[PDB]
Design a binder for this molecule. Structure first.
Ligand SMILES: CN1CCC(n2cc(-c3ccc(Oc4ccccc4)cc3)c3c(N)ncnc32)CC1
Ligand SMILES: [Ca+2]
Length: 430
């Protein structure tokens, strides 16, 4: 007998799922992934619920200040998001000491501006050995009144949002009829991209492929692999229409591409540490792809999507294997040798695209002119706004020998703490 509680409001939009409000208790009848079968204690209706909108009663995730599954860097980003203030805090899982918790608090010093500082909580719980607490609420309730040591006293828990609703149960392959493609977003040499609607009540984005040599069969073989590359900085692949012409249904990304975003009004008021934060997100996306032994092939700003809350996501991973040299590494251009290391090269140019607010690479140069410029060891110069240490990453990304190029793991780690010294990652307190 298991009892869960609703963390958010949810409105039913399918045949057999349930409507519930925040605070609603319900009984778990069945566990099966993103959708669970429950029994509402307020309506007594048996039906389906999203398994990420609930958690066990009295458990840790029921608390407003607790954030499950957040890395130190995610906590920093969520707490620097609009709607938070001094003392905005969260207790979360430790990313380094597995099974322990960490406190992240929004601070301000006039020399850097707003920051997020992190504290390790030790197993009973304590941050300062001087002061121990029985529960995590006792901890919180203490530092909430004055800061017995902290950079700031605790004010209000961090701003959260609804997680995205999980795609319908067993619906990887859908009939084309479910779609209303409402507006063309883009059109290229291989197909179109549309804002659409799935079964009247779910906004999505649809990539329609122009029926080329891309074998029906051979595509699904690769699409079923893209379905398994689920990361927060990879775009979410929802479904697929299996009959030629092929449709690719993904999550709708409000702000379009990174390229069109950097070139826009709102994109031009992004300070440099945000541009780097963007890069960090992408390097996290690639580190995952790298971890998973996989290849992007077409890494550039036009294939990176931006969401309404400015989270960066990677699109068309792999597509180039199934289906523009200024982004392409020499070995890839010369002998068709695409590796994760040729992506690192592509990541260097994207880095520059970011730092130049989307400006075309090698300005004034032709594709042939670029190729001969490379073979003589020419590289792009550092622009006015680029810090010197960020140029090194680009220059390291652009080494003649693939093996000499850094990993996305190391790149992510450098970009993540770009403004922080290793020693300042966690504040130590006596
Ligand atoms: C002008 N322009 C075309 C439309 C625009 N775009 C593309 C996409 C897009 C790109 C690829 C895509 O399909 C795949 C994603 C990952 C792997 C394979 C295919 C789905 C949507 C998109 C989106 N989801 N939401 C909002 N805007 C989007 C990007 C810039
Ligand atoms: Ca320290």
């Amino acid at each position: 007998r298991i009892i869960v509680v609703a963390l958010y409001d949810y409105e039913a939009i399918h045949h057999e799922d349930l409507s519930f409000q925040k605070g609603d208790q319900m009984v778990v009848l069945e566990e099966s992934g993103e959708w669970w079968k429950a029994r509402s204690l307020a309506t007594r209706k048996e039906g389906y619920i999203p398994s990420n909108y609930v958690a066990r009663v009295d458990s840790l995730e029921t608390e407003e200040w607790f954030f499950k599954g957040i890395s130190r860097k995610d906590a920093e980003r969520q707490l620097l998001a609009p709607g938070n203030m001094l003392g905005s805090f969260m207790i979360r899982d430790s990313e380094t000491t597995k099974g322990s918790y960490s406190l992240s608090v929004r601070d301000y010093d006039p020399r850097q501006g707003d920051t997020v500082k992190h504290y390790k909580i030790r197993t009973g719980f304590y941050i300062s050995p001087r002061s121990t607490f029985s529960t995590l609420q006792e901890l919180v309730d203490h530092y909430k009144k004055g800061n017995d040591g902290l950079c700031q006293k605790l004010s209000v828990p961090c701003m959260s949002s609804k997680p995205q609703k999980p795609w319908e149960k067993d619906a990887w392959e859908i009939p084309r009829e479910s779609l209303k493609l409402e507006k063309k977003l883009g059109a290229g040499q291989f197909g179109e991209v549309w804002m659409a609607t799935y079964n009247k009540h779910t906004k999505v984005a649809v990539k329609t492929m122009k029926p080329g040599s891309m074998s029906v069969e051979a595509f699904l073989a690769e699409a079923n692999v893209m379905k398994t590359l689920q990361h927060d900085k990879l775009v979410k692949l929802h479904a697929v229409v299996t009959k030629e012409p092929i449709y690719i249904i993904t999550e709708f990304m409000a702000k379009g591409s990174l390229l069109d975003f950097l070139k826009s009004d709102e994109g031009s008021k992004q300070p440099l540490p945000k541009l780097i934060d963007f890069s960090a997100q992408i390097a996290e996306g690639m580190a995952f792809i790298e971890q998973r032994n996989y290849i992007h092939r077409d890494l550039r700003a036009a294939n990176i999507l931006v969401s309404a809350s400015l989270v960066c996501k990677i699109a068309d991973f792999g597509l180039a294997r199934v289906i523009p040299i200024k982004w392409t590494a020499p070995e890839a251009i010369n002998f068709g040798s695409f590796t994760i290391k040729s992506d690192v090269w592509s990541f260097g140019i994207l880095l520059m695209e970011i730092v130049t607010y989307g400006r075309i690479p090698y300005p004034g140069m032709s594709n042939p002119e670029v190729i001969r410029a490379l073979e003589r060891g020419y590289r792009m110069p550092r622009p006015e706004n680029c810090p010197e240490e960020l140029y090194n990453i680009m220059m390291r990304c652009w080494k003649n020998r693939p093996e000499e190029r850094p990993t996305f793991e190391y790149i992510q780690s450098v970009l993540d703490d770009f403004y922080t010294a290793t020693e300042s990652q966690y504040e130590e307190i006596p």
